[PDB]
Write an enzyme that holds these catalytic residues in place. Structure first.
Site, mmCIF file in Angstrom:
data_model
loop_
_atom_site.group_PDB
_atom_site.id
_atom_site.type_symbol
_atom_site.label_atom_id
_atom_site.label_comp_id
_atom_site.label_asym_id
_atom_site.label_seq_id
_atom_site.Cartn_x
_atom_site.Cartn_y
_atom_site.Cartn_z
ATOM 1 N N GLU A 142 43.203 28.609 -73.432
ATOM 2 C CA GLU A 142 43.596 29.244 -72.141
ATOM 3 C C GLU A 142 44.173 28.200 -71.189
ATOM 4 O OE1 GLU A 142 43.904 32.229 -71.457
ATOM 5 O OE2 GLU A 142 42.619 33.364 -72.873
ATOM 6 N N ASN A 167 51.345 36.468 -64.538
ATOM 7 C CA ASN A 167 51.504 37.581 -65.506
ATOM 8 C C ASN A 167 52.703 38.475 -65.137
ATOM 9 O OD1 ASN A 167 47.946 37.765 -65.118
ATOM 10 N ND2 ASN A 167 49.031 36.843 -66.821
ATOM 11 N N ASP A 182 52.918 41.584 -64.622
ATOM 12 C CA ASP A 182 52.581 42.609 -63.599
ATOM 13 C C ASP A 182 52.505 42.026 -62.191
ATOM 14 O OD1 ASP A 182 49.999 41.475 -63.530
ATOM 15 O OD2 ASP A 182 48.934 43.280 -64.059
ATOM 16 N N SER A 192 50.178 39.781 -61.198
ATOM 17 C CA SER A 192 48.868 39.087 -61.101
ATOM 18 C C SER A 192 49.030 37.660 -61.645
ATOM 19 C CB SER A 192 47.798 39.835 -61.826
ATOM 20 O OG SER A 192 48.066 39.884 -63.202
ATOM 21 N N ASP A 244 46.612 34.287 -63.486
ATOM 22 C CA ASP A 244 45.375 33.807 -64.138
ATOM 23 C C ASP A 244 45.024 32.417 -63.596
ATOM 24 O OD1 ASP A 244 45.518 36.114 -65.754
ATOM 25 O OD2 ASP A 244 46.145 35.011 -67.552
ATOM 26 N N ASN A 253 41.921 36.614 -64.308
ATOM 27 C CA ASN A 253 43.095 37.322 -63.765
ATOM 28 C C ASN A 253 42.770 37.957 -62.410
ATOM 29 O OD1 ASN A 253 45.150 39.310 -63.608
ATOM 30 N ND2 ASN A 253 45.100 39.814 -65.772
#
Ligand SMILES: [Cl-]
Ligand code: NA
Length: 129
Positions: free
Chosen positions: A35, A46, A48, A50, A52, A59
């Site tokens: 990650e 991301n 959309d 959002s 992380d 998120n």
């Protein structure tokens, strides 16, 4: 803070992740490697809108408030910036809530695609606890 492998394994064990909801410590260390490359400061946007955050890429769509993810939740009741600290307490406590939500560690795409069904014990080989 960029952790070493065994340094992160010890910090995660001290914060209660070893066999947390049946996931051995090597699963958590493998998730963090893929990650964030063990970097508390990691951020990634991301599709959309959002973002992380942190060593486990938590998120803003669901878990934290970053002031720029409209129509999202803050289920961990934290600013997303708390997830970037050298102190992993906020990331660990929010990960315990995520892994308890129904999908277990499948919530972490990197874990499902790179760690699940592999010899994850390898990630804590040689480490003093
Ligand atoms: Cl599970
Ligand atoms: Na949010």
């Amino acid at each position: 803070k960029v952790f070493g492998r065994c340094e992160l394994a010890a910090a995660m064990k001290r914060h209660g992740l070893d066999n947390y909801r049946g996931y051995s410590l090597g699963n958590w260390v493998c998730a963090a490697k893929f990650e964030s490359n063990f970097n508390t400061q990691a951020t990634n946007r991301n599709t959309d809108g959002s973002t992380d955050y942190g060593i486990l890429q938590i998120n803003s769509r669901w878990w934290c408030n970053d002031g720029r993810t409209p129509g999202s939740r803050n289920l961990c009741n934290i600013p997303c910036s708390a997830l970037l600290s050298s102190d992993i307490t906020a990331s660990v406590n929010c990960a315990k809530k995520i892994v308890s939500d129904g999908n277990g560690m499948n919530a972490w795409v990197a874990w499902r695609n790179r760690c699940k069904g592999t010899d994850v014990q390898a990630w804590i080989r040689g480490c003093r606890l």
